[PDB]
């Protein structure tokens, strides 16, 4: 019953369009939370990603059985898509950038942008939870080189600065980024 051109459409449907930027691609998808758990536009633990807002809108116009399609407001999205009124819009807090982190970790914590990393870890934890795979939780354990480095960057009151070289953290990040890529299903 929420029309596509309504002022607060995405807020009212309770589902967020998100943007994921990597060094080689920018993707769009949808994500929500149901009883404290992230659910993405996807199926079987893999997130459907789209190269443009138009491609996402085209997909949402079609009948689908995926992890969002039985949510009570999903029909509002599909009807907006078929009405031609769906306006996919990503708010600034739903912009997630993995690009460059692999290079920044190699130069140490001072090369890593804290805000970028904070947002990236938010997405990573959501992907790990949605995929029902422990890869993210394990990699970010603070015993490990990467988890220790991430915790340091995200805490401006920490004096436990990891010391060069950062090769171990880089290797662990590369493995984690491969995991993320394995969970993004190109539609």
Numbering used by the authors: 234 to 420
Sentences reproduced from the published study:
Subsequently, constructs expressing SatSC or SatSN in E. coli were used to purify the individual domains to homogeneity for crystallization trials. Only SatSC yielded diffraction quality crystals diffracting to 1.4 Å resolution. SatSC displays α/β secondary structure comprised of a mostly parallel, four stranded β-sheet core, flanked by seven α-helices. The structure revealed a new fold sharing no similarities with any previously solved protein structure in the PDB based on DELTA-BLAST and VAST similarity searches. Although the overall polypeptide fold was not similar to known proteins, the surface of SatSC had pronounced electronegative charge potential that is comparable to many export chaperones, including SecB. Furthermore, the SatSC structure featured two surface localized hydrophobic grooves, mapped by the Kyte-Doolittle hydrophobicity scale. These grooves bore similarity to the hydrophobic grooves on SecB that serve as primary and secondary client binding sites to regions of unfolded preproteins. The proximity of the smaller hydrophobic groove in SatSC (Site 2) to the larger groove in SatSC (Site 1) as well as their amino acid composition (aromatic and bulky side chains) resembled the arrangement and composition of the client binding sites of SecB. The larger of the two hydrophobic grooves in SatSC (Site 1) was comparable in size to the ~60 Å long, main binding site in SecB. In fact, when we tested SatSC for chaperone activity in the in vitro anti-aggregation assay, SatSC alone was sufficient to ablate preSapM-HIS aggregation comparable to full length SatS.
